[PDB]
Design a protein around this ligand. Structure first.
Ligand SMILES: [Ca+2]
Length: 332
């Protein structure tokens, strides 16, 4: 009756909105969160996640584990330019977290539980690196055939990117190309992977119209203010229309595929392709996506590559979630 999910993220301004959806959208049973390295160091992305949940009141519902703390191979390089030093700069409203990251078990064990608990029905959602999920599947490969979908925000098609000398690579793939390949090339997994690339996410712009919706004379919670202050800082690091909010877009295909709403509503269109990426770090196009193969639209084989969705609908979902979050705000 409700889409069970695990979220691996690196908050992260756009990742904060991913958490908001998974916590508060009526369609999602969030089973837990794993934080990886990426936008900031792993200690920051951990704290940032637990701070958000504490602000939204969800710090005693949503289990938090520390995920992958570093890439498989490459030296960790973070993004201070876009996200700041804490990885979530621009808002002082973020409260000191009530709860610790849980240590009853490894994150691999926690994800193992969650998958088996929702055997065949769960979807894993990576808004950060693919290191967390690639490690789970290395260590516990039996778990592959239990996950229904893996919804990834990452990659860019046709040499679209925000990383590497040529801007040919997208961040989440670039920070661990090995982990990405291990996912994209595995025949068990690649066929049920959903990829939401820069091509698609760059449609998810937070314009003046969107900011009005988050904060206005009718609706001016401090929680609402927090989320506004994120959108603003994200925009300051840019698209004159405003900044794209990449990570929540990975939730939309699930709403269509699990059939929360009709495809007419969600409007999620996609292709079927095998993909890989350049994982030689010394390569100038390090991380750039290669399209290995392409398939007819009725194909079962191939990674599911997002092309278009209804951006109106996207935003309606975020606002829906935000009105419920507002009721559970712990910071005024
Ligand atoms: Ca992210």
């Amino acid at each position: 009756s409700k889409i069970p999910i695990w979220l691996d993220c690196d908050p992260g301004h756009d990742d904060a909105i991913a958490i908001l959806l998974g916590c508060f959208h009526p369609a999602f049973n969030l089973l837990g969160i794993s934080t990886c390295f990426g936008n900031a160091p792993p200690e920051n992305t951990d704290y940032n996640a637990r701070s958000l949940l504490t602000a939204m009141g969800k710090a005693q519902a949503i289990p938090v584990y520390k995920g992958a703390q570093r890439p498989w191979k490459r030296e960790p390089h973070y993004a201070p330019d876009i996200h700041g030093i804490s990885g979530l700069d621009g808002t002082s409203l973020l409260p000191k977290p009530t709860f610790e990251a849980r240590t009853d078990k490894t994150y691999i064990e926690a994800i193992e539980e969650a998958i088996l608990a929702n055997n065949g029905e769960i979807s894993f959602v990576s808004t950060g690196a693919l290191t967390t999920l690639a490690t789970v599947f290395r260590c516990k490969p039996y778990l592959k055939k239990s996950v229904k979908y893996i919804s990834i925000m990452g990659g860019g098609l046709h040499g679209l990117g925000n990383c590497n000398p040529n801007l040919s690579a997208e961040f989440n793939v670039w920070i661990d190309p090995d982990a990405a390949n291990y996912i994209f090339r595995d025949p068990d997994v690649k066929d049920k992977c959903i990829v939401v690339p820069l091509n698609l996410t760059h449609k998810a712009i937070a314009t003046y119209k969107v900011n009005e919706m988050i904060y206005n004379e009718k609706n001016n919670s401090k929680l609402r203010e927090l989320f506004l202050e994120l959108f603003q800082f994200f925009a300051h690091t840019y698209f004159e229309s405003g900044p794209p909010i990449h990570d929540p877009v990975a939730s939309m295909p699930l709403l269509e595929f699990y059939g929360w709403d009709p495809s007419s509503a969600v409007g999620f269109r996609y292709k079927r392709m095998d993909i890989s990426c350049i994982d030689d770090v010394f390569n100038e196009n390090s991380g750039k996506i290669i399209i290995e193969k392409e398939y007819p639209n009725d194909s079962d084989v191939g990674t599911i590559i997002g092309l278009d969705l209804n951006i109106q609908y996207f935003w309606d979902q975020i606002f829906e979630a935000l009105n419920r979050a507002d009721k559970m705000s712990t910071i005024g």
